[PDB]
Design a protein around this nucleic acid. Structure first.
Ligand SMILES: Nc1nc2c(ncn2[C@H]2C[C@H](O)[C@@H](COP(=O)(O)OP(=O)(O)OP(=O)(O)O)O2)c(=O)[nH]1
Ligand SMILES: [Ca+2]
Ligand SMILES: [Ca+2]
Ligand SMILES: [Ca+2]
Length: 341
DNA sequence: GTTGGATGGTAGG
DNA sequence: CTAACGCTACCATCCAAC
């Protein structure tokens, strides 16, 4: 069984680099402008030139302009990026019809049926890597191993524009010495509530009885982490089904004025239904982001699917339900649809 | 004594 | 306006309703 994994390199930035190659070789930042004030919003990504100086997805745009004033700052055009993602995901279908899209910029292939061993799997990476670069001028990073998780770790090890094979043998080696915070699924919170025990390697979980870990990071995470170390984890490439669609926007000013919020919430509803096209949801949730950036929400699941008009009415009640029970002023407002028929 | 809905925690692109 | 986007998926915890 062989999984080959692909993740494009600083995607949104790279795409923009492709459309304006003069940018190439100098710092580039792609931003999500909120509209609150000039430069309000966060970074969605930045090229490696920009990263040297501290500019990465997630930081406030002011921190970045502060820290890297003379760089290109471009507005995010997700839609344009999605075409390029789509056209690349089509190529990956050439090499394998068993493909799992994981994000806008990555995907796993099952190539157990195309190649015979890691050596040929490696050669395939080179072809896959070269087709994309010929038909889209986009470099990408390939990881190759015995399953999703390790194929993803190998990719992370080789970024950017790399290619790494993790063999039955080197898997032994990492399960033993790979830091625990570098395992997919393990973030700050956990990998700090892990050093709590003395677990530092994927291997150190085998050294603490189930019981203790179970009630420290939860049933699903424990079962998962242990089967990795014990080396029995095996999830198949499965086609993912979008399970929810949403929209959330930031308001010019914080409000508790229902009449002032409503327009924003209605904006969020129109663009979700467009975004739904055809799919019928039975569930709605209004999501509010508050002054202090706590995220609060109220939902409702219906017996039968929710029409656009039903959603206008329902969301409003839910907003009120939120206004009734949170004292804080609202800063961002949004909506999410789910439980699709 | 499941389950499954409501709200939130955590991770990640 | 005076910093912290916008998405999504999976899981944990609670409590009613069966
Ligand atoms: N709005 C927004 N978009 C993000 C965020 N993180 C990632 N993205 C988008 C923009 C990225 O180009 C794209 C791919 O993200 P990746 O996690 O794979 O990193 P990226 O490709 O940008 O650089 P690379 O993988 O790290 O070396 O997803 C984020 O926090 N916010
Ligand atoms: Ca990625
Ligand atoms: Ca990437
Ligand atoms: Ca981590």
């Amino acid at each position: 069984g062989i999984v080959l994994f692909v993740d494009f390199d600083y995607f949104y930035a790279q795409v923009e680099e492709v459309l304006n190659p003069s940018l190439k070789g100098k710092p580039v930042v792609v931003c999500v402008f909120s509209g609150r004030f000039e430069d309000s919003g966060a970074v969605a990504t930045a090229n490696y030139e920009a990263r040297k100086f501290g500019v990465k997805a997630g930081i406030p745009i002011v921190e970045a302009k502060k820290i890297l004033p003379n760089a290109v700052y471009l507005p995010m055009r997700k839609e344009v990026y999605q075409q390029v993602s789509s056209r690349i995901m089509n190529l990956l279908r050439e090499y394998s019809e068993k493909i799992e899209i994981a994000s806008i910029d990555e995907a796993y292939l099952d190539i157990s049926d195309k190649v015979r061993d890691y050596r040929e799997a490696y050669n395939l990476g080179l072809e896959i890597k070269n087709k994309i670069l010929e038909k889209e001028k986009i470099t990408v990073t390939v990881g190759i191993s015995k399953n999703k998780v390790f194929a993803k770790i190998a990719a992370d090890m080789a970024k950017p524009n790399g290619i790494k094979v993790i063999d039955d043998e080197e898997v032994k080696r990492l399960i033993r010495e790979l830091d625990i915070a570098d395992v997919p699924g393990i973030g700050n919170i956990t990998a700090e509530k892990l050093k709590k025990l003395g677990i530092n390697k994927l291997v150190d979980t085998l050294s603490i009885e189930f019981d203790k870990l179970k009630g420290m990071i939860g049933e699903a995470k424990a079962k998962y982490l242990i089967s990795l170390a014990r080396d029995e984890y095996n999830e198949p490439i499965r086609t993912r089904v979008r399970k929810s669609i949403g929209r959330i926007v930031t308001m010019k000013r914080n409000s508790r004025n229902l009449e002032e919020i409503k327009p924003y919430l209605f904006r969020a509803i129109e663009e979700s239904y467009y975004k739904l096209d055809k799919r019928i949801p039975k569930a709605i949730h209004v999501v509010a982001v508050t002054e202090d950036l706590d995220i609060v929400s109220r939902g409702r699941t219906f017996p039968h699917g929710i029409s656009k008009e039903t959603a206008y009415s329902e969301s409003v009640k839910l907003l009120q339900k939120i206004l009734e029970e949170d004292e804080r002023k609202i800063r961002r407002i949004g909506v999410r649809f789910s439980k699709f028929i």
